[PDB]
Amino acid sequence: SAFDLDVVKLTAQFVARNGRQFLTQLMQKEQRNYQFDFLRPQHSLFNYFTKLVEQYTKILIPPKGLFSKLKKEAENPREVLDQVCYRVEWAKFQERERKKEEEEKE
Amino acid sequence: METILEQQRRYHEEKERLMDVMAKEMLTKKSTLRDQINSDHRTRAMQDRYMEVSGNLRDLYDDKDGLRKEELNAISGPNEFAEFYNRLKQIKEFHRKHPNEICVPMSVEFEELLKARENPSEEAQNLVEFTDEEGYGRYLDLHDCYLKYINLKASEKLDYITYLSIFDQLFDIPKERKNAEYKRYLEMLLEYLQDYTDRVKPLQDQNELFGKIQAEFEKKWENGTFPGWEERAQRLFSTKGKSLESLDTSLFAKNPKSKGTKRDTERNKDIAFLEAQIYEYVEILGEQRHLTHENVQRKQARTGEEREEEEEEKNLPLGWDGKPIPYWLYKLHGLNINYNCEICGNYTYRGPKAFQRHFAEWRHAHGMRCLGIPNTAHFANVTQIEDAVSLWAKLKLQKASERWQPDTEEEYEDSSGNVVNKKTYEDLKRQGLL
Amino acid sequence: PNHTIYINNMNDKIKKEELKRSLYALFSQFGHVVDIVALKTMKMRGQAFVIFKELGSSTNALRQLQGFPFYGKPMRIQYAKTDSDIISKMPNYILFLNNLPEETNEMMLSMLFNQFPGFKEVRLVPGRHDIAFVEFENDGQAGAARDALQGFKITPSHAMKITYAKK
Amino acid sequence: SSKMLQHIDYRMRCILQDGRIFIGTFKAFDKHMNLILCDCDEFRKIKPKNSKQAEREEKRVLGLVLLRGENLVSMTVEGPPP
Amino acid sequence: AHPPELKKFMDKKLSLKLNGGRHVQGILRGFDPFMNLVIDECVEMATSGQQNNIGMVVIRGNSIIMLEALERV
Amino acid sequence: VKLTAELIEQAAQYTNAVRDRELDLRGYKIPVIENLGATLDQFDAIDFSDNEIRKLDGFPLLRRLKTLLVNNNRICRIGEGLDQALPCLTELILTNNSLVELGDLDPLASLKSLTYLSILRNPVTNKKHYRLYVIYKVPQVRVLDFQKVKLKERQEAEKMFK
Amino acid sequence: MKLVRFLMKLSHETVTIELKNGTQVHGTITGVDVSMNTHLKAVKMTLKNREPVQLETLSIRGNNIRYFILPDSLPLDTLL
Amino acid sequence: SIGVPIKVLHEAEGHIVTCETNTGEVYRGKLIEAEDNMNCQMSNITVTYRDGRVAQLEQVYIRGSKIRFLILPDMLKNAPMLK
RNA sequence: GGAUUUUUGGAGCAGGGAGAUGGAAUAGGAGCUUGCUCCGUCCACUCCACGCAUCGACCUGGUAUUGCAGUACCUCCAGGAACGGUGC
């Protein structure tokens, strides 16, 4: 739902700013007189929270939108072709891995 | 909202979906050549979607440089968290889900069922980029520039050999005066050809190739690109010779090189750009023009059936043992006679008892169901559908007639010495009088 | 009621075509525009009719635009007495119709009762005259058109009003 | 052949004896090919007689028009069939 | 191959518009299946209001694209 | 819900009430303003009766448009590039709409062709000097609230709010 | 015999028609009947002082045409 | 042979039609007698002569050779010619 | 079946004169670029003979009609000519 997704977005906003392993902006939200239902790791929503945290990190890396922005993407179809071919090469190696694993298991 | 955060969120989603779509589109392919040209254009355009994302994200410091100091505090927390969460604790009891929170970019940069195009991909194709014979990258448009040259020169022998020789080479002594509008006409044919080339090389950086061609036009012609041994240096776009390189340069900016000739350095600017673009396009498509010329040789000397079609590129019934049925027997069975059964999808039957049994066969059964009338016998051998519906119409009328309906027949007197039917009796009975 | 709606009470210094453009803009909202029958001869001046897709559409444009300001004088729109040539070539569930005509034609009575989302049937009490009971296959429809018909004119010599049938 | 017999019943811009374009949902042909254009209109150049005034076209509709055979300069399709 | 229907209009007055913007005011007198309506007591009407009585005009339908009626016939 | 060129081609493009080419799409609640130019230069009126369009925006280049029905819609604001896409436009009937404040009258004035307009049933209606703002911003207008504009109204609307 | 029958030798043929209203157009016409009736297709047409207007299925008339231009690979004696 | 154009002209004759001729002579009135050669007899017509003083005459003989077009009954849109 | 009504065509063309009135950045020639002189395509203002009349729609205010029927187009006075083709 949109409300639950917004709550997960706030969880990602807190995990982007949590600067210590035991100190953060969500330690208070856990036992601070409100409900905290995304704070579970044994909840399956913990996995979507981890994905949202990975997204907040992909926005929090300095090359990801803090103070530097590279234009090899905004005006780069050649680096884009390089990246397409890189994905394709990873895919070829992975198809080989799957075939070898299936054969070994059989 | 989230600008230095949510902006990067949108940009990450956009670039990641673009990278997945680009990987799939540049790893797997199709068979079609028009589809191949359009798909190179589509890979360039997916780079361009990531390109809009990047044009938003790479100068997006107006939020980052300023919110990184206000969100760079280590004191606050559940206060602002509680402002946000108490706003978020509104009535969100609307029990339904939404995958249109992460589930856009696959439908945006993925392949379709009939044409492999995403959300953008409603008109993604080589639609107007492929002419009749051109073949999306198989042939090109030399006929139009040829017709323009014909209407210009008007020569009783300006035929295939002369056309191909003028359109294959780069910078020979041309077969027409370039000191007339023939140069501008070559520039127009080269504009068409260069558009064709910008469509036929779509995955290459268009702006970067433009900048390379601009450095070419600005240095590589006029700064001694053609050396010599009058022969030290001369121009094919100026038509002035040089006693040496320094003489060429000095006549470039002298008086008669400034404004004292209608073929001056700027007064030949349009025809010079035409000459340069034409020479570059020809010297690139030396193989492409060669394949087009081979095709034209085929389209001139090939036989009529092959050429036209490429431009456009005993009934004997079965026995148990699967052979012809002999002729007196075929006549007996009378297969020749065909029966137009309109109910059966304009199916048409040979063999009369075959025809008849078909009325209970499936295709007729289906026909009936979808006609809206059961496959009861009463219509069998009525094959036209308007006849069927009027028949079943009167049949319906008769069935409703001979039905005894207690509602209109079964009739009740009220207490007041006057009579109504069952229906109205119970109606006014249970709506509070009777 | 009628799908052909009368729209009048405006000025005459306004043009037929211009007032037609105004009526189109102001009628594609409350109903559909099929044709605007506009005559500016003297026998019917300052008036026109719009033939809307639905009879409830026309009467609803009439009941919302019951005196809407326009063209020199607040224009009044109602249903017509009959329908136009295009469409011519084309609270409870049960309620007693009081002042029910001993003269009405069951056809027009049916088109009245089925103004609403389709009525079940109309039963003009054929004993002691001047009564009816009509039921609607949609009780909200019955109550809607019966409240809007409280005091309704049909054969204007009377007002045909339908209230919720009692217990 | 009867070339137009496929392209009829759609809104088609028929051309004039004087250079107008008239999109009528064309019906049928003849040996003189006189047009019977239904739901048919016209529009021609509102000549400014000048250049700082620009050129437009005022809208005229005949509805169904029986364009005599001397009319057609061309017949192209400007509306799909409704 | 069908004569034209000027039949009740014959021997009656018509004011015709022929090419050159001209008018011929006259009596319907004679014709052919070629529609060549011939007007006696027919007078020309020019661009200017000048008008000359022509005696007997045999005005070919080659040009005359209009003609209106003076009476009911 | 997807509003497509399905519902724009299947739309009715034929004789309107004032005998012009109108294309009705009644009965869709279409909130998506896309895929419209496929009227194919044979249309002047675009009607979206029973629509929920989040605001006034989303039309293609129509140099011919002569009527548009955006009534019974969810119009909250008014988008910018309206004139170059409707230069022949005089009738953009957006009554039963939800325009609120005179900042929704910012692109309203840039057209040279607006004369027959309707924004009725909006909270911009009973506000004081609202028709004054309208008679200021709309020079070439002739049909406003289905009664003529006035030179006295124009004097008031130019002179006030200096 | 007539050259109307010579123009009847044109189908899948690249032609150029200069018509009656100052028109000049490039066209692969659809099909031509005995009275010169040659309906254009994918044609770029320009009347007197005009634009390159496009018609994907158009019907260019007869006596309202002026000049016709045939293909270059068109044997004349074989076409008449 | 026989023209469904002529059938259209026969369905357009007898009542109010509006012919439009060569130089702008357009007559909107009762196109009484039209023969398949199109020499249309109109009755009680209002003809403009393209002059904008579109004046009403009676029983005009407007030839069809100059007839640029002819606005016919808008009620026979379902003709038997097209259907 | 290219001769007075439709498909072997009567189609083409050109916008009235002038003032030390003016705009052509990227586009005209010569006086061999800039400066400046004269010269063969328009529009804005103004002078004639707002190129001349008709009518139609409209903008302006006043003004008569409250009315039911399928429209070339339906008030009257007065101004202005923003727009159309008809005679020169």
UniProtKB/Swiss-Prot annotation, chain B:
What GO molecular-function term can you cite, just one? Answer: zinc ion binding
Tell me how this protein assembles: Component of the 17S U2 SnRNP complex, a ribonucleoprotein complex that contains small nuclear RNA (snRNA) U2 and a number of specific proteins. Part of the SF3A subcomplex of the 17S U2 SnRNP complex which is composed of three subunits; SF3A3/SAP61, SF3A2/SAP62 and SF3A1/SAP114. SF3A associates with the splicing factor SF3B and a 12S RNA unit to form the mature 17S U2 small nuclear ribonucleoprotein complex (17S U2 snRNP). Identified in the spliceosome 'E' complex, a precursor of the spliceosome 'A' complex. Identified in the spliceosome 'A' and 'B' complexes.
| Region span, Disordered | 294-313
Find motif (Nuclear localization signal) and give its ranges: 175-179
The protein's gene is named SF3A3
Q: Which residues carry this modification: N-acetylmethionine?
A: M1
The biological processes this protein is annotated with in GO are: mRNA 3'-splice site recognition; mRNA processing; mRNA splicing, via spliceosome; RNA splicing, via transesterification reactions; U2-type prespliceosome assembly
Tell me, in one coarse class, where this protein mainly resides. nucleus
InterPro entries xref list? Matrin/U1-C_Znf_C2H2, RNA_Proc_DNA_Dmg_Regulator, SDE2/SF3A3_SAP, SF3A3_dom, SF3a60/Prp9_C, SF3a60_bindingd
Q: Localized where?
A: Nucleus speckle; Nucleus
What is the tissue localization of expression for this protein? Ubiquitous.
Q: Which residues carry this modification: Phosphothreonine?
A: T408
Q: Which domain of life is it from?
A: Eukaryota
Task: Identify the GO cellular component terms for this protein.
Answer: catalytic step 2 spliceosome; nuclear speck; nucleoplasm; nucleus; spliceosomal complex; U2 snRNP; U2-type precatalytic spliceosome; U2-type spliceosomal complex
Q: Where is the composition biased (Basic and acidic residues)?
A: 294-305
Task: Supply the name of the protein.
Answer: Splicing factor 3A subunit 3
Protein family (similarity comment): Belongs to the SF3A3 family.
Curated annotation (Swiss-Prot), chain E:
What sequence ranges are listed for the domain Sm? 1-73
An annotated Gene Ontology molecular function = RNA binding
| Localization terms from the record | Cytoplasm, Cytosol; Nucleus
Q: Under what name is this protein listed?
A: Small nuclear ribonucleoprotein G
Cited InterPro entries: Lsm7/SmG-like, LSM_dom_sf, Sm, Sm_dom_euk/arc, Sm_G
Entry-linked Pfam families: LSM
Purpose of the protein: Plays a role in pre-mRNA splicing as a core component of the spliceosomal U1, U2, U4 and U5 small nuclear ribonucleoproteins (snRNPs), the building blocks of the spliceosome. Component of both the pre-catalytic spliceosome B complex and activated spliceosome C complexes. As a component of the minor spliceosome, involved in the splicing of U12-type introns in pre-mRNAs. As part of the U7 snRNP it is involved in histone 3'-end processing.
* Subunit details: Core component of the spliceosomal U1, U2, U4 and U5 small nuclear ribonucleoproteins (snRNPs), the building blocks of the spliceosome. Most spliceosomal snRNPs contain a common set of Sm proteins, SNRPB, SNRPD1, SNRPD2, SNRPD3, SNRPE, SNRPF and SNRPG that assemble in a heptameric protein ring on the Sm site of the small nuclear RNA to form the core snRNP. Component of the U1 snRNP. The U1 snRNP is composed of the U1 snRNA and the 7 core Sm proteins SNRPB, SNRPD1, SNRPD2, SNRPD3, SNRPE, SNRPF and SNRPG, and at least three U1 snRNP-specific proteins SNRNP70/U1-70K, SNRPA/U1-A and SNRPC/U1-C.
- Mind telling me which Gene3D superfamilies this protein's record contains? 2.30.30.100
Where is the signal peptide, in residue numbers?
Answer: none
Family from the record: Belongs to the snRNP Sm proteins family.
Gene (name only) = SNRPG
Q: Which organism is it from?
A: Homo sapiens
- Provide one Gene Ontology cellular component: nucleoplasm
Swiss-Prot record, chain F:
Q: Which Gene Ontology BP terms does the record give?
A: mRNA splicing, via spliceosome; RNA splicing; spermatogenesis; U2-type prespliceosome assembly
User: Where is it predominantly found?
Assistant: nucleus
Location(s), subcellular: Nucleus
Keywords (alphabetical) are: Acetylation, Isopeptide bond, Leucine-rich repeat, mRNA processing, mRNA splicing, Nucleus, Phosphoprotein, Repeat, Ribonucleoprotein, RNA-binding, Spliceosome, Ubl conjugation
Domain of life, source organism? Eukaryota
Q: What is the effect of changing R26Q?
A: No change in spliceosome assembly
Question: What's the impact of mutating N72K?
Answer: No change in spliceosome assembly
Q: What is the effect of changing Q147R?
A: Results in defective spliceosome assembly
A single GO CC term, please?
Answer: nuclear body
Q: Where are the LRR repeats?
A: 19-40, 42-63, 64-85, 88-109
Q: Does the keyword Cytoplasm apply?
A: no
Sample GO molecular function, one term: U2 snRNA binding
Look up keyword Lyase and say if it applies.
no
Which part of the chain is the LRRCT domain?
Answer: 122-160
Protein's job? Involved in pre-mRNA splicing as component of the spliceosome. Associated with sn-RNP U2, where it contributes to the binding of stem loop IV of U2 snRNA.
Q: How is this protein organized at the quaternary level?
A: Identified in the spliceosome B complex. Identified in the spliceosome C complex. Found in a pre-mRNA splicing complex with SFRS4, SFRS5, SNRNP70, SNRPA1, SRRM1 and SRRM2. Found in a pre-mRNA exonic splicing enhancer (ESE) complex with SNRNP70, SNRPA1, SRRM1 and TRA2B. Contributes to the binding of stem loop IV of U2 snRNA with SNRPB2.
Sequence similarity: Belongs to the U2 small nuclear ribonucleoprotein A family.
**Protein name, per record:** U2 small nuclear ribonucleoprotein A'
| Gene behind this protein | SNRPA1
Q: Which residues of the full protein are shown?
A: 2 to 163 of 255
Curated annotation (Swiss-Prot), chain G:
Q: Where in the cell is it found?
A: Cytoplasm, Cytosol; Nucleus
Q: What species is given as this protein's source?
A: Homo sapiens
In terms of one coarse class, where is the protein primarily found? cytoplasm
**What name does the UniProt record give this protein?**
Small nuclear ribonucleoprotein Sm D1
State the Gene Ontology terms under molecular function: RNA binding; U1 snRNP binding
UniProt KW keywords? Cytoplasm, Isopeptide bond, Methylation, mRNA processing, mRNA splicing, Nucleus, Repeat, Ribonucleoprotein, Spliceosome, Ubl conjugation
Q: How does it assemble?
A: Core component of the spliceosomal U1, U2, U4 and U5 small nuclear ribonucleoproteins (snRNPs), the building blocks of the spliceosome. Most spliceosomal snRNPs contain a common set of Sm proteins, SNRPB, SNRPD1, SNRPD2, SNRPD3, SNRPE, SNRPF and SNRPG that assemble in a heptameric protein ring on the Sm site of the small nuclear RNA to form the core snRNP. Component of the U1 snRNP. The U1 snRNP is composed of the U1 snRNA and the 7 core Sm proteins SNRPB, SNRPD1, SNRPD2, SNRPD3, SNRPE, SNRPF and SNRPG, and at least three U1 snRNP-specific proteins SNRNP70/U1-70K, SNRPA/U1-A and SNRPC/U1-C.
Region (Sufficient for interaction with CLNS1A) residue ranges read 1-80
Record's comment on post-translational modification: Methylated on arginine residues by PRMT5 and PRMT7; probable asymmetric dimethylation which is required for assembly and biogenesis of snRNPs.
Name the domain of life: Eukaryota
What other note does the entry give for this protein? In the autoimmune disease systemic lupus erythematosus, antinuclear antibodies are developed with Sm specificity.
Q: Record's GO cellular component, any one?
A: catalytic step 2 spliceosome
Domain Sm, chain residue ranges per copy: 2-74
The text of the family note is: Belongs to the snRNP core protein family.
Q: What is the effect of changing L58K?
A: Loss of interaction with CLNS1A
Q: Name one GO biological process term.
A: mRNA splicing, via spliceosome
